[PDB]
Write a protein that binds this DNA or RNA. Structure first.
Lengths: 136, 93, 116, 78, 56
RNA sequence: UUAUUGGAGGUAGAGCACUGUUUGGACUCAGACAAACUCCGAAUGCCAAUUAAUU
RNA sequence: AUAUGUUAAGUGGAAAAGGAUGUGGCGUUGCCGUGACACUGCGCCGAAAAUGUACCGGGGCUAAACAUAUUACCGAAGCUGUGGAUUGUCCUUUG
RNA sequence: CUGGGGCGGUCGCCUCCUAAAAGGUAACGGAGGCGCUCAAAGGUUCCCUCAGAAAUUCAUAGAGUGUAA
RNA sequence: CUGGUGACUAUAGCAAGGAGGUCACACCUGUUCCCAUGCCGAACACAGAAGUUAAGCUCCUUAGCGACGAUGGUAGUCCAACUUACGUUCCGCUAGAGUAGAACGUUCCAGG
């Protein structure tokens, strides 16, 4: 789906989540975009699900950009283990989406088609989003 | 043509800018070579109405001291979550 | 062209960290050109000079112009410095190999009453 | 399900030992370090294990050597 | 002198640094007051414990 | 304890100038991520002066 | 109690994604009284558990609620008034 | 020692991160190494400047520094 | 304005154009001698008919690359108070733009 080909350290801390988005708030690559207004971890699973939805709606006529990427790995432990005896094993890969960040961008379609596509993509993501267009 | 702009003198405490930005006025600075650092107040309703006519990087008419000196907009702040302007750096030509 | 005088200043910098950087002073700084040879007594607490002597200050008699002129220059500096009351010197060779002309400027100043 | 980590060294108490503008005696240590984060100025010497000590007794002062480098110096009192 | 300082709030539940400044001001028990010449150094102490003390 | 002065240090933040991860163009341009990245960088805390005003 | 607004669920007096011609505000446009929307305040559905009401302490209240701003009072072994006891330090009076 | 004990792992030293810009700072928290080697891989004096890309040019250092950082 | 030698955070540079000659600085000329190349008078070092500004070098104009860099705003935060992320006071970045900016400078010797 999406993950680094190699990371240097397999077991990192969890990333901070309080605050606001530091960069990537503007619709740079395309015409319309979907903006996040709530902090969360976006796994590569829901990224690859939202992308399938958004692209299947447009019938693969327009162009789509994904402005986020799962870099940080999170670990989990076996089902009945007691606390202690080391760290877990790697489970998935996340991105941190704080309020402001533009998640997906779409270009090459009408306004209403992109609005419906970015509506149907935002039902597979665990955050609340809104529809923005390129800052006039 | 000419737009009135009251000057904000002295230190603007954080609550001053906070309760002004919740009312429809934005700080701004105007400088260049000859006129420098008149921290003034600019309205958010007329500024958008003039930027809709002249553009983002055009020449925006503004009265620096009840007079037009063909000030040009250099850069501006903007928060993506509310669609409200934050600040303008008004380079004088 | 390696610009011979520029490769001399790197060597001089490497020379001049243990010499009037923590050591005895004044310096007797020399300088070697294609034709002449210069030397001056310097102190570095202030940064001022106390003597001068050259191979072009009317020391010429048309001898073997390169080594003997160094000897005359050294004698002149040694008689100047003992005038003002300076019987102590550290010899900064300036990054020239201590051989021939610089060696002659040095060993012709020891014999003239200026003891390293 | 043991762990393979769990050993660490013992912290060498490094850093500065004498503040700026302070009087120090003829042998006091001024800065522990590995390598030279700080250089010896004047009346300050460097030990075989990188460390900065005062050679005489006077006021200690931290200056800047060139750019992106600093040094420590001891100066004569009175 | 000037600057009559009166302790208004207790110093129970306040950090130790705030308690030390109140002792330096000379204030002792709650509702006690002192008179001190105005300085730039006395103004700083009152500012640190400004919530606890009342100045006139 | 405060206020005036000087100093050591690299975290919050931000940034891509090194190390690594990363998206879309041309044949280098834009855009992002980092406890064990830093060209940068606080507020405070700390060390002092042999300084004052309180206590 | 005084002044100006909000809401109508008994919210207040538990809980999310998401859904909606509930109602107040400001703003901004498109056709001449009707449409679009932008950001907002207060709500409403989502909302199912075991002895007994049972998620205000009770009665009871839509004002005895919420927001905004003033003027009083109640309230502690705090502080102060009066009397007394012990230990100190000052000497206005070894007081 | 031990998120009860047993079975498993660990026990001394060095270097990073956690560590919150002085110093110190824990967990069966995250990563590695040591139990040496050198008679010149030691002292002193002179001289020199690298990797890599196309004997020449570019190069600020991207090399090397016995052995981890 | 020339030379030697120190101090300075590239406002001190890199790059591109123009000017300057043997009074200074170098190129040069060649290995008799001092010394030298792990091969090689290329360097180092020794002595110097004669010639040139070509290169080095010093100076002049450039804001292309670097280095420097405000005010305003933002992020972040010590303190306080509400209570779960604000709301009041203080300090206050980074980035980016307006800008300095094609160095100042001591002591000696010389044509002056």
């Amino acid at each position: 789906m999406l993950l680094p080909k190699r990371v240097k350290y397999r077991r990192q801390h969890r990333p901070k989540t309080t605050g606001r988005s530091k960069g990537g708030n503007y619709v740079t690559f395309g015409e319309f975009g979907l903006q996040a207004t709530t902090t969360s971890w976006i796994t590569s699973r829901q990224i690859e699900s939202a992308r399938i939805a958004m692209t299947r709606y447009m019938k693969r006529g327009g162009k789509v950009w994904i402005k986020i990427f799962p870099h940080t790995p999170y670990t989990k432990k076996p089902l009945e283990v007691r606390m202690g005896a080391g760290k877990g094993a790697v489970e998935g890969w996340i991105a941190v989406v704080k309020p402001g960040r533009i998640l997906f961008e779409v270009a090459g379609v009408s306004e209403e088609v992109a609005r419906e596509a970015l509506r149907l993509a935002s039902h597979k993501l665990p955050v609340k989003t809104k529809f923005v267009k390129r800052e006039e | 043509a000419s737009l009135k702009s009251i000057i904000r003198q002295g230190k603007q405490t954080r609550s001053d800018l906070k309760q002004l930005r919740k009312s429809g006025k934005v700080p701004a600075v105007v400088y260049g070579y000859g006129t420098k650092n008149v921290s003034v107040k600019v309205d958010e309703v007329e500024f958008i109405k003039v930027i809709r006519e002249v553009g983002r990087n055009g020449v925006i008419e503004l009265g620096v001291g009840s007079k037009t000196i063909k000030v040009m907009v250099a850069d501006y702040q903007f928060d993506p979550l509310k669609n409200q302007i934050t600040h303008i750096d008004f380079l004088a030509i | 062209k390696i610009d011979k005088n520029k490769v001399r200043l790197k060597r001089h910098a490497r020379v001049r960290t243990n010499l009037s950087g923590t050591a005895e002073k004044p310096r007797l700084n020399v300088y070697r050109s294609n034709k002449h040879i210069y030397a001056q007594i310097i102190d570095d607490n202030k940064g001022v000079t106390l003597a001068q002597a050259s191979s072009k200050d009317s020391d010429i008699a048309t001898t073997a112009t390169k080594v003997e002129l160094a000897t005359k220059v050294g004698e002149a500096i040694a008689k100047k410095a003992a005038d003002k009351g300076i019987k102590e010197i550290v010899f900064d060779r300036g990054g020239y190999l201590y051989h021939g002309r610089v060696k002659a400027l040095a060993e012709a100043a020891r014999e003239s009453g200026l003891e390293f | 399900s043991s762990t393979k980590n769990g050993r660490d060294s013992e912290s060498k108490r490094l850093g500065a030992k004498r503040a700026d503008g302070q009087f120090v005696t003829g042998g006091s240590i001024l800065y522990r370090q590995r390598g030279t984060k700080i250089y010896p100025g004047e009346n300050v010497g460097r030990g075989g294990d990188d460390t900065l000590f005062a050679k005489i007794d006077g006021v200690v002062k931290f200056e800047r050597k060139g750019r992106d480098k600093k040094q420590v110096s001891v100066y004569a009192v009175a | 002198a000037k600057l009559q300082i009166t302790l208004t709030r207790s110093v129970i539940g306040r950090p130790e640094t705030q308690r030390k400044t109140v002792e330096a001001l000379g204030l002792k028990k709650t509702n006690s007051s002192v008179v001190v010449e105005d300085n730039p150094a006395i103004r700083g102490q009152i500012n640190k414990v400004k919530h606890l003390v009342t100045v006139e």
